[PDB]
């Protein structure tokens, strides 16, 4: 959970440019860890 | 919310801490109102009575005298639960998780049913704290009232054998399509018997003196059968009403008591209350703010008060 | 427009506005020429009264 | 003020109807909202520091 | 043709779901909707026992 | 020619129409794909059987 | 209740041994099988005349 | 009987029912491959003997 | 850690239009059906 | 008025007497004013026809009429497995010339 | 509170505007709780469920289904209603319009059908866009449960004919249920489907129980205690009804679920649960017809 | 057609290796798979000797 989630806390410390954009959830069966932006998260603070 | 907490008592299996994260929006039956409580009375080992585990009718009777609670926020130290029976005063509409094969509706009353499905067991296991967890399955209430009548009558067939072994299974359900098969493994007798008696004893009081005049119009029912659509569809094929067709009994004392009006009162008193005295009380109602008309399987639906 | 719910406060914001045609004659036609796919499979289902 | 192609012949006379036509404005909502958690209420105000 | 190569068969026994319902025999409103402003009797040889 | 294929046989009725063939189909006569389902936890094998 | 070209499957009596009695003691229904003898034993919806 | 299933089929009599045939096959294709810019992030570690 | 804007201006007949397509820019990823 | 003709097929009054007239059995089955059906959630395809109430003059100014053919939310909804008559929420801006 | 807006559609007349001025403080039902709504979700034409106009059953399905909203202030281009079902208990005081009974200082009033009273009263129609707003009647819990079982009892004597059920005194007043001249002939055809529901759930179960309990007790704690609290009640009903009526297990237990499935429908249909409370402050404790009342949120 | 302008032959004496192996009669698990969840009685005229 968090050893994937710290990477999203490390994504909160950003350097990395993502070039082309499509829908993420079509590639849900591709990633190792998925988080979902829903306007807020009480954990990220 | 009138905040109630349940702490993480002793140790953690490190993936199982994440198992408590994906149970956000589920229901805990805690048999109290506490500011803090151990996790021992939470699990199904507390649902197991002295020596024996309840059946899916006994778990109805086990979910009778306990208190449901909503998982609100999950800490690694505690789990904050909101006491459904009192602390439903939420204009923020504290959120629940739908763990059910049925895509519901908007506006359904939602009552809780034990896991009895063939493939949605909701079994999550903790081995550091040796506990078994059965989450209840939130369902729409007419579909909930279609289930509890099956499982008691299936246990009514657990009293008498007589018939040949090909019985109607009471194990095919219908919601717009959607053939559902449930589990028929064990039927404890006392959970059947006490549920059967209130089905008997309430149907006793639901008959009165002026009720008897209605029984005369049973041949009047089939006179509407061959001359309309609505009645013929109302009259079921697998009914005793089509079977019983193949009278004031005067006793008239006073005749100013409104005997026909008094019949529909006490009939509604006990035969009108047959879903809620057998099963759990509905207090959860579907209410989405975004105008979404249905709520997907696995979603987080906003929850409002008693229907 | 504020509304306080469970959790925290929840601000809602809306801006009222309108329109008009502002054209005495026809304006803005719209043609329709390409098809992706049929939504239905074009049939073979009885009707049940 | 529509034109006139005022005619020869005994067909009767053209007549300029310089009419005022009206329209009607609609009203629209266009609503938007955003969350705010249970914390950051004492924060962003000055309570819990 | 369906939404593929897809030859589909209708084969009138499809229509059992519509025509074999006992709504076929409802003409009671129909005689009432025709009897108003009644027509004179026409030579009732074939209309009488 | 290269490596050999292996033909296997399945007992089918003679009056199962050729219209089911000349079309991409299962050899069993019924669709069986799990991708055809809709995540109901019973739309596995009770789709197939 | 039709599964195989060389056999039949029909809902018969529960336990009764075949060469005996006049009326079977109709109790529970236990299904059983039998051997189809010839090619003609297959049903005529699976073979046109 | 499967013994009789010789002689009906070893002579050429149609044995009352039909079949379907399933083979497997294999090709060796050619495959072109586009990519984006930042398609990977690659780490070179340390050699050891 | 009164200006120029790029667009596409095809001229047909003796006219000129701002032939521009959306949904790659301002409808994408917002769960909105492109109208 | 089947003392008159059919404007579609001009040499005759109908093409089907068992469809056209009043109480002509489409008029009993497929007219929502009588609605022996219509307790069903299944969308009838035939309700656009056989409805004297909805085509009771319906609108007649032709110039305004064609701009409503990028409008007039359909009888159908694409959201079900077998198509249903439209629930009052979630409008769709359908084209629908028929 | 969380006030929700219902959009006024295009061109209406001044009497259509004045029709919107005679409804400030009524009760409105709506399907979803979107912060901007339209009038198309409100009207009685939005209650079609099977292609025909709904009956008092077809309304009371929706009247227990969709959501009450009470219009505080009427507006041009909008309708402001602070809805009841949102908010914590006993907060957000709202104001209603009484109809002919009192609505005392308590009572917990309940929304219910119009044709149990004058049918073309409170069926307020908009003339321009041609829609109909049939506002429900806010009756308090004792009398609301009283009148619902009387007309369906009056539907029985109107069903197959050969006292008078319609007097029904209140605490002070004599409440004339009968609005004779044109309503009662429309009553027994607009509660038409509903009477069949109160009947068929009685004819099924009683003729099921008299072949259930004789099939039970010999097919034992529930056995002897069946007639223990039913001594000379159920056996007396076995003496009275089974004699002047007629007299199969595998269809029987199949009918057991089906009747009790219909029973669970009717409990959600009937009995008219309280939704909002009158418990005011500094009033005369007694409301009259046409006068406002401070009404608080939860029972 | 094979891997050429070849033409092959699959005449139904091909079926000799597939079905004639003595597993065609082997239906013991099928009756063992169906006999649970027992059937109702089905008026056995021709099922009873």
PDB file of C-alpha atoms in Angstrom, chain C residues 21-39:
ATOM      1  CA  UNK C  21     -30.472  33.627 -30.988  1.00  0.00           C
ATOM      2  CA  UNK C  22     -29.698  37.174 -32.291  1.00  0.00           C
ATOM      3  CA  UNK C  23     -30.341  36.198 -35.886  1.00  0.00           C
ATOM      4  CA  UNK C  24     -33.444  37.108 -37.813  1.00  0.00           C
ATOM      5  CA  UNK C  25     -32.889  34.274 -40.266  1.00  0.00           C
ATOM      6  CA  UNK C  26     -31.421  30.818 -39.954  1.00  0.00           C
ATOM      7  CA  UNK C  27     -27.908  30.503 -38.617  1.00  0.00           C
ATOM      8  CA  UNK C  28     -25.616  27.561 -37.865  1.00  0.00           C
ATOM      9  CA  UNK C  29     -26.746  24.460 -39.761  1.00  0.00           C
ATOM     10  CA  UNK C  30     -25.312  21.057 -38.835  1.00  0.00           C
ATOM     11  CA  UNK C  31     -24.754  18.203 -41.270  1.00  0.00           C
ATOM     12  CA  UNK C  32     -24.408  14.560 -40.301  1.00  0.00           C
ATOM     13  CA  UNK C  33     -22.001  12.481 -42.365  1.00  0.00           C
ATOM     14  CA  UNK C  34     -19.976   9.649 -40.846  1.00  0.00           C
ATOM     15  CA  UNK C  35     -21.165   6.671 -38.741  1.00  0.00           C
ATOM     16  CA  UNK C  36     -19.197   4.931 -36.017  1.00  0.00           C
ATOM     17  CA  UNK C  37     -21.501   1.942 -35.366  1.00  0.00           C
ATOM     18  CA  UNK C  38     -25.087   0.939 -34.642  1.00  0.00           C
ATOM     19  CA  UNK C  39     -25.956   0.998 -30.968  1.00  0.00           C
TER      20      UNK C  39
END
